[PDB]
Amino acid sequence: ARPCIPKSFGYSSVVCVCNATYCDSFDPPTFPALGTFSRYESTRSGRRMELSMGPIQANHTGTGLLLTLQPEQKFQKVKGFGGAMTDAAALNILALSPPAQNLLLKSYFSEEGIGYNIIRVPMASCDFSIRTYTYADTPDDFQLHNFSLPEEDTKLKIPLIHRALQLAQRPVSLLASPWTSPTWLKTNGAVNGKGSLKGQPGDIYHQTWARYFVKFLDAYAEHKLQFWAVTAENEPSAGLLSGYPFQCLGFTPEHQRDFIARDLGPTLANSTHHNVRLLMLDDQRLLLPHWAKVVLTDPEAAKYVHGIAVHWYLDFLAPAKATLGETHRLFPNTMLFASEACVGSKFWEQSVRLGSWDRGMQYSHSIITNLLYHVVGWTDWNLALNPEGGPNWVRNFVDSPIIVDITKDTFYKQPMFYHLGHFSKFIPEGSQRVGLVASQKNDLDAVALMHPDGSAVVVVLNRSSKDVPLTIKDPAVGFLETISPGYSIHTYLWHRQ
Amino acid sequence: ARPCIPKSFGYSSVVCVCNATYCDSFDPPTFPALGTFSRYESTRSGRRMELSMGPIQANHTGTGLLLTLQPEQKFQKVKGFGGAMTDAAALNILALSPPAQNLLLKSYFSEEGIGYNIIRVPMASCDFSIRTYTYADTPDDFQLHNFSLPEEDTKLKIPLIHRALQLAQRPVSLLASPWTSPTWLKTNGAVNGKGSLKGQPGDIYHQTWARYFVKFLDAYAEHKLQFWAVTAENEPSAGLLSGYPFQCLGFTPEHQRDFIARDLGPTLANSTHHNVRLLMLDDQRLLLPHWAKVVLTDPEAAKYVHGIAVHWYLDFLAPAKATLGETHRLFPNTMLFASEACVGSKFWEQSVRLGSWDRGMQYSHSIITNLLYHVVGWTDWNLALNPEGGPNWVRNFVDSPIIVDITKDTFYKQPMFYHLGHFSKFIPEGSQRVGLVASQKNDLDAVALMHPDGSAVVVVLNRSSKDVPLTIKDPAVGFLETISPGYSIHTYLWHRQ
Amino acid sequence: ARPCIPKSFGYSSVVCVCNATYCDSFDPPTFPALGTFSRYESTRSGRRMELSMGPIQANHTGTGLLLTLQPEQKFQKVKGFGGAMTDAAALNILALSPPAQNLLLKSYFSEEGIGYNIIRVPMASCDFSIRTYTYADTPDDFQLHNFSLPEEDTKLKIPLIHRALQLAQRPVSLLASPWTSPTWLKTNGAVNGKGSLKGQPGDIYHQTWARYFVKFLDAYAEHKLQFWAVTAENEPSAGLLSGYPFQCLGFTPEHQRDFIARDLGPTLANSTHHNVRLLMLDDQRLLLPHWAKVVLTDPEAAKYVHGIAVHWYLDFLAPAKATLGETHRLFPNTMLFASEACVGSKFWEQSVRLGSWDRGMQYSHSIITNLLYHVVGWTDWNLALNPEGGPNWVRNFVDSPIIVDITKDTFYKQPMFYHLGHFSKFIPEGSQRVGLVASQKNDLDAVALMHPDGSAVVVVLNRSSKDVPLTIKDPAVGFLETISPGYSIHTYLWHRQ
Amino acid sequence: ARPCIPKSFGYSSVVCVCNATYCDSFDPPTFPALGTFSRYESTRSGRRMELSMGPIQANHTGTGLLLTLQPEQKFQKVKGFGGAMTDAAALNILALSPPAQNLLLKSYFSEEGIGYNIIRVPMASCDFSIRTYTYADTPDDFQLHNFSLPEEDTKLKIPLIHRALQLAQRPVSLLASPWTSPTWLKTNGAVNGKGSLKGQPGDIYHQTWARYFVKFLDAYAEHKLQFWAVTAENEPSAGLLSGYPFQCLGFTPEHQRDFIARDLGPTLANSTHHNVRLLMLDDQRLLLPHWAKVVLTDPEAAKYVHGIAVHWYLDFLAPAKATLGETHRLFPNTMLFASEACVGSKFWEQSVRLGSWDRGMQYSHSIITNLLYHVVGWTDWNLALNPEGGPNWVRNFVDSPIIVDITKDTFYKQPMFYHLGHFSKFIPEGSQRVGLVASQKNDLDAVALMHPDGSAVVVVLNRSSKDVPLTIKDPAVGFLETISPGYSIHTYLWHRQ
Ligand SMILES: *[C@@H]1O[C@H](CO)[C@@H](O)[C@H](O)[C@H]1NC(C)=O
Ligand SMILES: *[C@@H]1O[C@H](CO)[C@@H](O)[C@H](O)[C@H]1NC(C)=O
Ligand SMILES: *[C@@H]1O[C@H](CO)[C@@H](O)[C@H](O)[C@H]1NC(C)=O
Ligand SMILES: *[C@@H]1O[C@H](CO)[C@@H](O)[C@H](O)[C@H]1NC(C)=O
């Protein structure tokens, strides 16, 4: 169906412009006939998940790069891919007119879009908020008698979450993370700054904070929304830092272990939302494997933890092997999951660059590394942001795949959107990553998986400027001859039988 | 009856701290025999509307500046003083515990406070809201069948206004201003930006818009609330700039004239709400006399306009004589009314500065200038904000007389609150401005008025660092020997017989 | 001609891209033949000062809008047009390769560019500096023994001014303004803040500050640069404001008058630079006429003041007539001159909008209004800035006609460049503004002038979206039949005898 | 000799205030008989390198943590400690009066100070410069006939270096690093941005770049200055990132390897500067082991490389063992050297925080880690900055141990300065690191070394708030009983014979 409408804003590539009557979209997905493959391609020069098809050949000779599928070499199963319905995202998406709202959400959740099946929902405010509430701001309300959802949940977040789940055919999983507790639970009595929960695990502060999770879940449930998982805390390590600028609650690894063991675990387990999964960490991967060891080598915490959630920000100084690889090595039965990423973020980095192809490649590059080191899902931060990278109450502006221009009733799908979509669209839940051996060294990032149904998907990213010819070999069926254009991303799909 | 608990946040003066169980207040007001006066004094060093009394003597001991009351020189009568019940004010007030809410409302509205008698009510969202909405967002509802009040009005604003009116002895007048129409009535299909109504005065867009005012007043009346006056649009000049960041609807002085003549006047006059006054402009005074020349020289428009509303905003605006005074010269029978002021702000300054004497002095200096140029009322912007100048979906750029810290169930009454009250408390509705002649050039700002019962009120602001020896003469009573200290504001009240 | 090479960044219009080998330029200037006129046209839709010619007709019929020249009604003679060589502008310029530096300079200063003949030069640092510094930072150095120029002058500004002057055919006039004195001369001991010169006019602080001007001139003279004029102070009113964020030195109008009379006037007179002119004010036109009355009615200050300089930032609260008009009325023989303007200065306002036509129109609209009220020249602020609108040590970033992209070795000429050039290129020094009566109300902005040689220039701006057919009538020659397209600026030139 | 004059600027500890006539200093250093130790102590509460002496006893009365010297366990020898004479440092130091310049230089370089013995020198401009420039900006001077030292070198940098060496009793080693080449050697023809050399190693560009290094070394040699070493490029990885803001010149580890092999090693070997050592990397340590494996396993490259230079960047950075420790294991005979450290972001803290104890601890913590992982030297960034962290032509983002306030002819010594001196003062060149075994898990950071003459030195950092009881055992002498106060740093020195 409708192709991308490009616009340039002076960066390395175009955005696709959507408005109330128009937005680029896909035909209903089909599988290629046996003997043939599907290819989706996006390029710096302006191609956007464009479909073509070719034959799978019985024969290959040559000495080009060859990537061989190893279907018998099974690794992790995939959970999925999505983004965060923060107060900022929900507010920008609802400031468009109704028809443009639907196109924005179809872009993400529809099979005519990119098939998101994760939404991370913050528990009360974060920096991507326009004020600093919590759900229990009445001081010393240890019974949480005055716990309630503000309009940010009931008017913004929740309605849009329902609207998304209605557009998706895949089941979608919700993931909640808190940034701060009520201030009267905290040693410093502020939403920000250095400060943790008062007292010691097992006590009334810790028991209240754990009941707060259940009240959150109870409230979302009145609104007919169920969670797949919760994290123990957003970036617990942030709250150990003096002058930390926005909402945070600090835990040392040991504090997190004992809060889970004493309070959060038992309290969740004793409640009707006992099937909600718990993920620890929810922080930079530099803190691994150590935080995993401290928590998971204690069997009283360990029985309550489904998985470890990682944020990407320090990936660059934390090699995947030493962090993710090792963690998996030690706790192979405890899933690794990526719960948050953005560009950028860093003091040198400018916030939103409309049309940036470099940012797109950062995303797919980090997705491919994640999948090659055991990680079962990948989750972007804000679903949508304004051209400033906000709102953000503390001016901590960042970039997002969809940029909303409220004065235009229009939105811009960035390269970050399409680079993500190269995975989210073609790797349903249950996909199992498999082996893929390169015949010689190369500058490509490639990853192979199998869908629950047996069929193959391979993603290939080219971040160097030169076209690279390659053959994908699958012994069940044959050879795929193709080229990786420079600054391209490709997904290949084929039936195996 | 209870004194100010001062607190310093490191600016030039203190705030007054209030909480669920304590707030500063006044005894019922009570005034002495002929020959005696009352002085209420607030200083930068900490005095807050403190009362003393003294003699009005027949012998003149002062050899300094003399201010002589000239009761026969008679000017405008006063409508009153108030502030705006924006979504932001309501949300801040409603996040205090109910005893703290009552103390807050009594501070403004009761005789034990500063005696407000004006509330401004936005019609649907503005920047001081946590979301975008109008009362009719279901597209092309040209008969306004789906017009309704959201929760902002039914849960937050309306109960708060009901409670203000119960606490008030004085009759309270409500004033209403739209920021935006439904976006389907708009050139640009956007709640913000450069964008006016579709079509031309008299057509179906323009009739629908005008009907929206009647549906508005209908709705509030169903809630037992009646308006004194509506404005023709908040800040119509802003709807003609750029991608104006907040909710707006642009009108040229011409387009307002025609909308008033063809649509809004006709529609209002046709309804039960025909007694509601219509105010034009609602914008910076730089736009006068020109806007008034445009609208009011049209008999078809002018028969429906009861006054001209002006914004102060306040870092900032035009000379008074050339704008306010010239407008009064040309149209002496159309009242002038200040419908919105705010401060700073002010790129090198906080939105909120707790204890800023200077932002207080700015309020009183401007109310005085206003009174001296035929303005009949002055109404503040947001009644309350948080310590960030929020919530504001776009950006905070302004202070408020009261700052709520909900995490501590506390509120702070800023020096601005007391500069407002030095007028609002002691200048009831119907009071008349009268002459007051200075005997020599001086630094003070002074205004004299007469109460409906003929008693005298004089306010004196000293914005300089120096104590000014002062004498006030009432021809009918005598000489009041006094001193205006540096950085103070005084209100003198005395019986004339 | 090399034509404009356009680029969009998503705003209303295009920039013209220039690099080390290419930059849009004009052919050498020519007179249109008697009986013919020349037209230069710039439009929103992409035309950049492009030349055509048409006939001057013997007669006219219509009914249409007729602008009639009144050659015998004569007003001010023009000094010229230009911009500021700040530390920021100089730094951005000299960060391009040498051949790109000369293209940028030829753009402004040569006949194949837009013929600038004013350069405003800061005396030390302002906000558009990357450090605060004065020429005399050794504390208490009343003799100015350690006065010297830093590299900001000797390596950046000076060499770039020598180059500009070499590229200009027209004589260029240098105008200097100080933001701060050494901090030891100031009551507050800081470069910024509220604070003025210590002591009293006539005294050592004041005499030293006046000798610093002569030492500035001495130093520039050593480097073969001569000044046309100095202002008494950049924005003297900013030093009267508490917490003023960057470099400033406060003067009341009375302190200004008295410093000129006692110190700066005599000190410049007794020096070899006695022919350098002195302009007072160098601040917002709101301060007029009062600042003018206070200074110029003192014959001892008056004998030293050649002119009054005005900045544009508060033009919009200060109708031109009340300020510029009244001041000229009171002091017809003391020239008015616009010495600084920029856009993006509010909050509200974004900083750099690459290719913004609105900002372009804001510049031309202000130049016409200035020329219609007696003003003899107009000076832009920074000559060039980076795409963030800096550098600026205090982050007070703004727009500029030329934006330098150091990383691409490229520069962008904005719509503001072309809008200024429709004036600077065509109105040499000595042009006298003359009458131009319109036949009916219109939405156009127009101004006529006569070159020294006796020929005619008319500039016409259309800020409405509507094409407006007009006839210009000169009685010496005939009718020019034309159209003013919407969002266009035109210059018309013709010989008269 | 003279004690610290403290001043608080509202951070966690004091600065020590120096001017033209006073600065804190040390007596010439002097050490007691066998059986007695010296302790220099600095505390957050205000103690600054305070000296006391005590006994080393036969009897062990301590029951807490024991640290036992292990002199026979012998590690790397130390090259030294210093910082960078950038343009920004030089500009700050010389805007002080001569007497204050000498007290600043004696602070760092004399034994009455902290005995620096390393100065790093930028080759032409970097971000800590007030203008862009190289030594060869005349385009296409491939024999570099137009190679010259600007005033930054000949006026600022060189005389200051000369005076540092006059003041030093220790011999000082100079380290040179380039940021960018002349831009006509650059793929991108820009001073910053994503750009490398043109062409390929061996060619005309690369031989020109290599010769540039010799030209530099010839020039400084004419000013009677010789280099210890040069680095192959400052932060080579920075110039592989799209539009990098500061001067860079990108090399992949491969291009560095070939540039060293083909061009730089060969040219230097063939010159009179063949003794100048060459350090590779000069970048973040996250780039190790990889960068070292690429360059050092190529024998044509390795013959030419004396060491690997690392940046500490410093509110990040990668784990020590896997970078520095693994690099030592793989290439045990190639020295590691810390060539640049600084603090800091993060985005919510000032560039400069005057008296920030935490920042001091960061210096000492990270020096100790260095030492514990085979690093032979540690060299600070800018020696001095202004109170803004400037001048920086791009953006201030880092602090400095000495902050200069020129307007008051004063300088401020940071905690960071003293945290550095606890090493640089007491660990002379040729000291060897030795074993020091902790008896139990503890919080302190501790390192032991031996002077060339056999005497012992141990430094103990307490980054926690609790006092830690401490015994230090020397097998040859006995037990030194002591306390490591909360937030202290200690240097102990003793004769072993
Ligand atoms: C929306 O986009 C389409 C595709 O470019 C265009 O034809 C249409 O005019 C747009 N509608 C609006 C309201 O801009
Ligand atoms: C409220 O204010 C009063 C007077 O300042 C004080 O005594 C009281 O403790 C406050 N209440 C609380 C909960 O702090
Ligand atoms: C300079 O611009 C011209 C005109 O567009 C173009 O042909 C050329 O590519 C540019 N040169 C460089 C170095 O980019
Ligand atoms: C320099 O410092 C010393 C030590 O505080 C002090 O007594 C002296 O006044 C200072 N000199 C100046 C110019 O303040």
Short mmCIF file of N, CA and C in Angstrom, two decimals, chain A residues 285-294 322-324 326-327 330-331:
data_model
loop_
_atom_site.label_atom_id
_atom_site.label_comp_id
_atom_site.label_asym_id
_atom_site.label_seq_id
_atom_site.Cartn_x
_atom_site.Cartn_y
_atom_site.Cartn_z
N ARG A 285 24.19 -2.31 31.46
CA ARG A 285 24.80 -3.62 31.52
C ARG A 285 26.22 -3.66 32.09
N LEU A 286 26.86 -2.51 32.31
CA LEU A 286 28.13 -2.47 33.00
C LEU A 286 28.02 -3.07 34.41
N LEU A 287 26.82 -3.07 34.99
CA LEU A 287 26.58 -3.56 36.36
C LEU A 287 26.48 -5.06 36.41
N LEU A 288 26.63 -5.69 35.23
CA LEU A 288 26.64 -7.16 35.05
C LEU A 288 28.07 -7.71 34.78
N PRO A 289 28.33 -8.98 35.20
CA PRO A 289 27.39 -9.90 35.89
C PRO A 289 27.20 -9.69 37.38
N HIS A 290 27.96 -8.80 38.01
CA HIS A 290 27.90 -8.62 39.49
C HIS A 290 26.50 -8.52 40.16
N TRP A 291 25.62 -7.67 39.63
CA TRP A 291 24.27 -7.51 40.20
C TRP A 291 23.48 -8.82 40.10
N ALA A 292 23.69 -9.55 39.00
CA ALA A 292 23.10 -10.86 38.84
C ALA A 292 23.58 -11.82 39.94
N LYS A 293 24.89 -11.87 40.17
CA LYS A 293 25.47 -12.76 41.20
C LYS A 293 24.88 -12.49 42.62
N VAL A 294 25.08 -11.27 43.12
CA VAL A 294 24.48 -10.79 44.37
C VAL A 294 22.99 -11.18 44.51
N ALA A 322 31.55 -10.09 28.11
CA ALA A 322 31.87 -9.89 29.52
C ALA A 322 30.67 -9.60 30.43
N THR A 323 29.59 -9.06 29.87
CA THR A 323 28.41 -8.69 30.65
C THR A 323 27.30 -9.69 30.41
N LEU A 324 26.56 -9.53 29.31
CA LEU A 324 25.53 -10.46 28.88
C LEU A 324 25.98 -11.87 28.73
N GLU A 326 28.63 -13.68 29.95
CA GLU A 326 28.95 -14.20 31.29
C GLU A 326 27.73 -14.42 32.24
N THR A 327 26.82 -13.45 32.27
CA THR A 327 25.58 -13.52 33.02
C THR A 327 24.76 -14.75 32.60
N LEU A 330 26.43 -17.90 33.76
CA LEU A 330 26.14 -18.20 35.20
C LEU A 330 24.69 -18.55 35.52
N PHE A 331 23.74 -17.93 34.79
CA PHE A 331 22.30 -18.08 35.08
C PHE A 331 21.55 -18.29 33.77
#
